[PDB]
């Protein structure tokens, strides 16, 4: 009835993530137990366990227990002459897949069975080297970027080729849809193609606004947003329905904060944060509040001068942790106080 | 900037506005004299709330008595300025459930004093019920909310252009409970329960329900009917009264939105089969025109729709046999169409005994 | 810009199409030819008003802001000059 | 699932223009309340 | 034709699912009613394209040398190709 | 035949804009000279 | 008009505009526009107004009459209402305080008007008005803010 | 489709990629003038290699004075479908409707500029 005949509060916390200011605290480095000086190519959080995997230009692949204080080492594996271009977990999380720069063989590490299977020969595949690849969220498909604008679809369980898709021009980047029923491929002339997984047909061809050539592409888990990065540092965010039906879609908001070409795009699992990065400049990483399409003003503390060049970003499955990998061999980790679960 | 950073200036402005309003209240037909000043009072404070990076509890604690004074006044412009201030505060800051409850209570209780500011006030409530936590508001202001003249007509007028979903989302769970309480018991008046059922009927007929309010209403009706039918006392006469009260509502909810009742019945089959509540489910589906196609079989815990086309062939015979009994008896929960396509589809399958049935 | 100022602008260039070929900066300093060449030879500061000084918008503004308004008016004015010279439909929709 | 961005005061141009005018030029508070509350509502 | 503008330009890979310095020469093109383009390339392959989207539909590698001739019957259920091998 | 064509491309000619702004200045000069004589000649009769 | 055909009335008006060229043409144009609405409809008035919109000797009654005709018609296109006011303010905006005040009340009272434009109209009114007319508009607006109007 | 016919030298998809790539190089070597007003001064000074214009300027007439000046100086001019693409190629965070590549002695873009000039004039047959 009245709040000034008693003593009490007026301001309370919201369930949704607040805009403008992000509450964060620095944590211990992910690769603290295993220090290195080589560039960190990939960092990723395990889907079902508190495990973080760090791979880099040094030939080692490591798995770490995710603890804020110490981050103890679980296991580290060194390959002979295999500088890891990209390493990722499977959708189920049971096996680890890694690839190298200018190497034909693809390494599959099955943790449950304790077997390391090198897939050097894929039948029906004419590709000389395998460096760029993506995995579907459902876990039934694997996509390999090739040459002459070729996309190769492989079964996950047996690693055998299903079919091929050819686009005009070079393949710059590719990603899978949230439902895993479609493929988004960005070409080298700024055009983006949409392919159907079940029948390898081109559903639609739309054009990213003001893009000479694209470098990255990402999709949200809920299926609402599609993000495309270009050479000028401009990231365009679209509705997924707009991309499917319009040849010249109008983006919801074009992020002009980054000034150098965007190479990394990562969506928050709750679809409230978009992380953008450029490796050509130091301190070139930003965070975007998705519903408002506004950038948090407090994340990059440029005086500390720790982030430097950014090559890989990842979020914990419940968005409790944020990971960052640089060229100095430091896998930086931050905790977001808004999310209390790993 | 000096208004939001320095609280003394804001207190000065509010005190000046209140004193000027109190001075000019005595003279009849002096509302125009307070125009510009009140506009100034509307112009700055909202803008101040826009300018502040974070609105601390001090600002809201200072603003609240003046908000209450604006709500209690009879001047239209002063109430309008209070409404704008309340709207901006609700948009910007998150509030505890108690303070939202008190603010909504004060908005609802003083709505009818000025008849020219009803609509905006209701719309203001919608904003307060859209930017806050869903269960912030309680049940205490519900009667005074129902007693305002021509509530559903104003709600429909607002609905033609803007979304009115939060107010109905708040209203319906209370409306069903209050209707059941009127059916079995006493209220403030019999016309109170009558105006409750009239409100729910008018909401069903005139205002289109969107954002899955249909599923919520159907689930509330089914769940609470089953819950009251599960009371320790028999109340057979009260049960019949409740049935004749809910019959037209179920009729119209089926008619306007066809498939919602089927889905909500499908979602609730499992726990009804788990418990010994098959007879109550049969009574509820008999209350509807369609939904008797989900009648449980006499011997097993399966629905009639699933019994007709599930893989196991022998027990399917009983289903058609049950349909035959449903054929001969007084069909009340089932319709002609379902029986027709069921028999037409079952004439042509593999099993010869099924063909004979 | 007005009836009188527009008429003087056309007369200076000799025709409407000749005025259309000019840039936005030239239209601003079209009237002030004596100050322009005196400043250019002596390496002094260039004039900023020209014939636009007698425009209605420039006249109303305070003397401190008469410099900013002159270039904003001149940049927008040439857009009306090009469309009136080359467009085949006579209307005031864009100018308003 | 679906994320919807509710309207905000600073984004609306009409509300900003109404708030940038001098107070004596400004119209009565009832009209301002009508426009403000209508703009704050979600349009369907 | 009722325009004279090139709606689609289709890039042909110089080697079958690969790249080479030698330029690929399209020796013959056949056009069907459904909208599919049949092309024969110097890399030794016959390619089926879709005109509506301007993307490759299928490829067939049939020879180690040039495939140089294309011909389709009046009823579009059969066609013939010739290779440099004879 | 010629005058049928370029007539339809007329009313977009500015020869009367450059001939009516120059005349507008000339009339101002003659007005200034003529008023001065009127005030001067009649100022010897009613100077106030 | 009383005892002759419609076409002859228009012929007399056109002869009158040719004979009278100076300030006396002001009353001629006003009666010509009034006749067009009576003899014809709104469409006839629109044709006459378009022909006479460029004959510079005018009065404020010419534009006020045309605004009233648009108001009586069921359409009430607000773009045309603004379009007539801009032409009137171009001719007599420097000295007519009432015309500026009448324009501002249209944006408030009319259902299709935009009240948020009143900030720009007041700003434009001060600069174009000269001398005592500027002071008159302030006093009239100050009375309009109160109920005295 | 849906292009104003007054932009006759319309480059196709392949030529547009070559055009914007060259414009990007010219920005890096400080050989590009940005804006319709700055472009116009280059033709009057006769130091322009070629002119690139944006076809989707909603009033297209505001840039139609440039083709007339080009035809006197014998300077090739071409239209592109997007001003947003033209603005990003020029390295500006705002749309650009006209840009000019200027004459520079000793430029390493001379072979590329010559090739594009042969391409643009080839459109006019």
From Swiss-Prot, chain A:
GO CC terms in record: nuclear membrane; nucleolus; nucleoplasm; nucleus; Pwp2p-containing subcomplex of 90S preribosome; small-subunit processome
WD repeat residues: 35-74, 79-119, 125-166, 167-205, 207-248, 257-298
Keywords, ordered alphabetically: Isopeptide bond, Nucleus, Phosphoprotein, Repeat, rRNA processing, Ubl conjugation, WD repeat
Biological process per Gene Ontology, one example term: rRNA processing
Residues bearing the modification Phosphothreonine: 7
Positions of crosslink type Glycyl lysine isopeptide (Lys-Gly) (interchain with G-Cter in SUMO2): 303
Key word Chloroplast present: no
Keyword Repeat: yes
Record localization: Nucleus, Nucleolus
GO molecular function, one term: RNA binding
Principal localisation: nucleus
Functional description taken from the UniProt entry: Part of the small subunit (SSU) processome, first precursor of the small eukaryotic ribosomal subunit. During the assembly of the SSU processome in the nucleolus, many ribosome biogenesis factors, an RNA chaperone and ribosomal proteins associate with the nascent pre-rRNA and work in concert to generate RNA folding, modifications, rearrangements and cleavage as well as targeted degradation of pre-ribosomal RNA by the RNA exosome. Involved in nucleolar processing of pre-18S ribosomal RNA.
Subunit structure: Part of the small subunit (SSU) processome, composed of more than 70 proteins and the RNA chaperone small nucleolar RNA (snoRNA) U3.
Family, per entry: Belongs to the WD repeat UTP18 family.
Name of the protein in its database record: U3 small nucleolar RNA-associated protein 18 homolog
Organism listed in the record: Homo sapiens (Human)
UniProt lineage: Eukaryota, Metazoa, Chordata, Craniata, Vertebrata
Name of encoding gene: UTP18
Region of the whole protein represented: 215 to 556 of 556
From Swiss-Prot, chain C:
Tissue spec: Ubiquitous.
Post-translational modification: Sumoylation is essential for high-affinity binding to snoRNAs.
Annotated compartments: Nucleus, Nucleolus; Nucleus, Nucleoplasm
Coiled coil: none
Residue ranges of every copy of the Nop domain listed in the record: 1-96
Residues recorded as bearing Phosphoserine in the entry: 15, 62
Positions of crosslink type Glycyl lysine isopeptide (Lys-Gly) (interchain with G-Cter in SUMO2): 64
Lineage: superkingdom: Eukaryota
The family this protein is said to belong to: Belongs to the NOP5/NOP56 family.
Subunit-level organization: Core component of box C/D small nucleolar ribonucleoprotein (snoRNP) particles; the core proteins SNU13, NOP56, NOP58 and FBL or FBLL1 assemble stepwise onto the snoRNA. Interacts with NOLC1/Nopp140. Interacts with NOPCHAP1, NUFIP1, RUVBL1 and RUVBL2; NOPCHAP1 bridges the association of NOP58 with RUVBL1:RUVBL2 and NUFIP1. Interacts with PIH1D1. Part of the small subunit (SSU) processome, composed of more than 70 proteins and the RNA chaperone small nucleolar RNA (snoRNA) U3.
Function statement: Required for the biogenesis of box C/D snoRNAs such as U3, U8 and U14 snoRNAs. Part of the small subunit (SSU) processome, first precursor of the small eukaryotic ribosomal subunit. During the assembly of the SSU processome in the nucleolus, many ribosome biogenesis factors, an RNA chaperone and ribosomal proteins associate with the nascent pre-rRNA and work in concert to generate RNA folding, modifications, rearrangements and cleavage as well as targeted degradation of pre-ribosomal RNA by the RNA exosome.
Protein name from the UniProt record: Nucleolar protein 58
Naturally occurring in which organism (per UniProt): Homo sapiens (Human)
Annotated gene: NOP58
UniProtKB/Swiss-Prot annotation, chain D:
Transmembrane segments: none
Subunit-level organization: Component of the proposed t-UTP subcomplex of the ribosomal small subunit (SSU) processome. SSU processome is composed of more than 70 proteins and the RNA chaperone small nucleolar RNA (snoRNA) U3.
Protein name: WD repeat-containing protein 75
Function: Ribosome biogenesis factor. Part of the small subunit (SSU) processome, first precursor of the small eukaryotic ribosomal subunit. During the assembly of the SSU processome in the nucleolus, many ribosome biogenesis factors, an RNA chaperone and ribosomal proteins associate with the nascent pre-rRNA and work in concert to generate RNA folding, modifications, rearrangements and cleavage as well as targeted degradation of pre-ribosomal RNA by the RNA exosome. Involved in nucleolar processing of pre-18S ribosomal RNA. Required for optimal pre-ribosomal RNA transcription by RNA polymerase I.
Species of provenance: Homo sapiens
Localisation: Nucleus, Nucleolus
Organism superkingdom: Eukaryota
Swiss-Prot record, chain H:
Residues marked Interaction with U4 snRNA and U4atac snRNA (site): 58, 83
Tagged with keyword RNA-binding: yes
Keywords (A to Z) from UniProt: Acetylation, mRNA processing, mRNA splicing, Nucleus, Phosphoprotein, Ribonucleoprotein, RNA-binding, Spliceosome
Compartment list: Nucleus; Nucleus, Nucleolus
Phenotype upon changing residue 35 to K: Abolishes U4 snRNA-binding
Membership in a protein family: Belongs to the eukaryotic ribosomal protein eL8 family.
Name of the protein: NHP2-like protein 1
Organism, as annotated: Homo sapiens
Annotated gene: SNU13
